[PDB]
Design a protein around this nucleic acid. Sequence first.
DNA 1: TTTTTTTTTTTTTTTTTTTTTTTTTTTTTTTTTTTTTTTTTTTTTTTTT
Length: 51
Amino acid sequence: GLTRRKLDEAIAKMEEAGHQFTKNNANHYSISLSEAHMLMDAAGVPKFHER
DNA sequence: TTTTTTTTTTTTTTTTTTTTTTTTTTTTTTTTTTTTTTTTTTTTTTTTT
């Protein structure tokens, strides 16, 4: 449920760190499930409890 | 008057989602064949003339 602009904001906040968004056989960003968790953990979306 | 770097055009390739067609398997289906109960036909004996 993250709009494209929100997801680009999240990856602009995240990617400059040491993390690399692992790509599959192609360049397509193959964000692992844990990668997605971390991304939206620090993306700024409050959890169902922390909100 | 010249050079360097970055933000825009466009171009190329891949994955996921959603397009169609065919075959195999499953369901409803009358014809033919098979099974059972039966009304008509055949045989013998006893009694009477």
